[PDB]
Design an enzyme around this catalytic site. Structure first.
Site, PDB file in Angstrom:
ATOM      1  N   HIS A 241       0.781  -1.231   0.000  1.00 25.26           N
ATOM      2  CA  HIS A 241       0.000   0.000   0.000  1.00 25.26           C
ATOM      3  C   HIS A 241       0.820   1.293   0.000  1.00 25.26           C
ATOM      4  O   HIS A 241       0.347   2.318   0.488  1.00 25.26           O
ATOM      5  CB  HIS A 241      -0.917   0.022   1.232  1.00 25.26           C
ATOM      6  CG  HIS A 241      -1.832  -1.158   1.343  1.00 25.26           C
ATOM      7  ND1 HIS A 241      -2.878  -1.377   0.473  1.00 25.26           N
ATOM      8  CD2 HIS A 241      -1.877  -2.169   2.245  1.00 25.26           C
ATOM      9  CE1 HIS A 241      -3.520  -2.476   0.827  1.00 25.26           C
ATOM     10  NE2 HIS A 241      -2.929  -2.978   1.895  1.00 25.26           N
TER      11      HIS A 241
ATOM     12  N   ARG B 223      -0.038   6.532 -13.486  1.00 27.93           N
ATOM     13  CA  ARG B 223      -1.055   6.095 -12.486  1.00 27.93           C
ATOM     14  C   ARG B 223      -2.274   5.518 -13.220  1.00 27.93           C
ATOM     15  O   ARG B 223      -3.403   5.698 -12.727  1.00 27.93           O
ATOM     16  CB  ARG B 223      -1.453   7.271 -11.584  1.00 27.93           C
ATOM     17  CG  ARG B 223      -0.344   7.763 -10.663  1.00 27.93           C
ATOM     18  CD  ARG B 223      -0.714   9.040  -9.930  1.00 27.93           C
ATOM     19  NE  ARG B 223      -1.715   8.842  -8.888  1.00 27.93           N
ATOM     20  CZ  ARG B 223      -2.169   9.798  -8.079  1.00 27.93           C
ATOM     21  NH1 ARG B 223      -1.712  11.036  -8.180  1.00 27.93           N
ATOM     22  NH2 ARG B 223      -3.077   9.513  -7.161  1.00 27.93           N
ATOM     23  N   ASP B 224      -2.044   4.824 -14.340  1.00 32.65           N
ATOM     24  CA  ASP B 224      -3.102   4.342 -15.227  1.00 32.65           C
ATOM     25  C   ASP B 224      -3.206   2.810 -15.175  1.00 32.65           C
ATOM     26  O   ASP B 224      -2.677   2.185 -14.260  1.00 32.65           O
ATOM     27  CB  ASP B 224      -2.843   4.850 -16.654  1.00 32.65           C
ATOM     28  CG  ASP B 224      -1.480   4.438 -17.194  1.00 32.65           C
ATOM     29  OD1 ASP B 224      -1.015   3.313 -16.901  1.00 32.65           O
ATOM     30  OD2 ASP B 224      -0.871   5.254 -17.919  1.00 32.65           O
TER      31      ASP B 224
ATOM     32  N   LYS C 261      -5.336 -10.075  -6.817  1.00 34.89           N
ATOM     33  CA  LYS C 261      -6.105  -9.381  -5.789  1.00 34.89           C
ATOM     34  C   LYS C 261      -7.185  -8.531  -6.465  1.00 34.89           C
ATOM     35  O   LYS C 261      -6.899  -7.804  -7.416  1.00 34.89           O
ATOM     36  CB  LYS C 261      -5.172  -8.506  -4.950  1.00 34.89           C
ATOM     37  CG  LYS C 261      -5.783  -7.927  -3.685  1.00 34.89           C
ATOM     38  CD  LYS C 261      -4.710  -7.285  -2.817  1.00 34.89           C
ATOM     39  CE  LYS C 261      -5.301  -6.531  -1.637  1.00 34.89           C
ATOM     40  NZ  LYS C 261      -4.258  -6.068  -0.680  1.00 34.89           N
TER      41      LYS C 261
ATOM     42  N   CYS D  57      -6.259   0.182  -7.683  1.00 31.44           N
ATOM     43  CA  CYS D  57      -6.256  -0.799  -8.770  1.00 31.44           C
ATOM     44  C   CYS D  57      -7.394  -1.803  -8.604  1.00 31.44           C
ATOM     45  O   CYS D  57      -7.328  -2.687  -7.735  1.00 31.44           O
ATOM     46  CB  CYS D  57      -4.924  -1.557  -8.806  1.00 31.44           C
ATOM     47  SG  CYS D  57      -3.463  -0.497  -8.837  1.00 31.44           S
TER      48      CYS D  57
ATOM     49  N   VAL E 151      -6.818   8.539   4.346  1.00 31.46           N
ATOM     50  CA  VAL E 151      -6.583   7.106   4.442  1.00 31.46           C
ATOM     51  C   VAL E 151      -6.789   6.646   5.883  1.00 31.46           C
ATOM     52  O   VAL E 151      -6.487   7.382   6.832  1.00 31.46           O
ATOM     53  CB  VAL E 151      -5.184   6.709   3.908  1.00 31.46           C
ATOM     54  CG1 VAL E 151      -4.937   7.349   2.546  1.00 31.46           C
ATOM     55  CG2 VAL E 151      -4.080   7.087   4.886  1.00 31.46           C
TER      56      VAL E 151
ATOM     57  N   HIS F 191      -2.054  -2.179   8.462  1.00 34.98           N
ATOM     58  CA  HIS F 191      -3.221  -2.586   7.690  1.00 34.98           C
ATOM     59  C   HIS F 191      -3.919  -1.345   7.139  1.00 34.98           C
ATOM     60  O   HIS F 191      -4.013  -0.332   7.823  1.00 34.98           O
ATOM     61  CB  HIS F 191      -4.149  -3.417   8.590  1.00 34.98           C
ATOM     62  CG  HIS F 191      -5.589  -3.403   8.180  1.00 34.98           C
ATOM     63  ND1 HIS F 191      -6.119  -4.309   7.288  1.00 34.98           N
ATOM     64  CD2 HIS F 191      -6.616  -2.608   8.565  1.00 34.98           C
ATOM     65  CE1 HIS F 191      -7.409  -4.065   7.133  1.00 34.98           C
ATOM     66  NE2 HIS F 191      -7.735  -3.039   7.895  1.00 34.98           N
TER      67      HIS F 191
END
Length: 120
Positions: free
Chosen positions: A12, A20-21, A39, A80, A102, A113
């Site tokens: 993360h 960033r695509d 994932k 993603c 966040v 986490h």
């Protein structure tokens, strides 16, 4: 044993992306060992390691609902989202870049986490 902070970092955190695509997500997800099997959803945070580490303090952090912590500042993040119902590779992804808070869990003043649910 900070091997869960390092794990967080791996999953993360990406300091300075550039792209960033789709192409980005599809690559980084594989490089970070999350594309075998694929994932369904995963988000990376960009910028200062300092800023994220500071969510565990009251410097850049508040207590959130159930023993979590939410950032004061908003972060440059990239989410993603896996495309198709394919459990195994190829893992093709759709990227969703944003600027927002966040929410993480901190152990020994280190986040371990990331509450993924907040994205989708």
């Amino acid at each position: 044993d900070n091997s869960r902070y390092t794990h967080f970092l791996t999953q993360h955190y990406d300091a300075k992306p550039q792209g960033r695509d789709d192409r980005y997500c599809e690559a980084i997800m594989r490089r970070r060992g999350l594309a075998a099997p694929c994932k369904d959803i995963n988000t990376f945070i960009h910028g200062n390691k300092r800023s994220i580490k500071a969510i565990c303090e009251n410097k850049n952090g508040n207590p959130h609902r159930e023993n979590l912590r939410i950032s004061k500042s908003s972060f440059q993040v990239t989410t993603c989202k896996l495309h198709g119902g394919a459990p195994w590779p190829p893992c093709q992804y759709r990227a969703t870049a944003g600027f927002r808070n966040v929410v993480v869990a901190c152990e020994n003043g280190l986040p371990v986490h990331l509450d993924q649910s907040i994205f989708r």
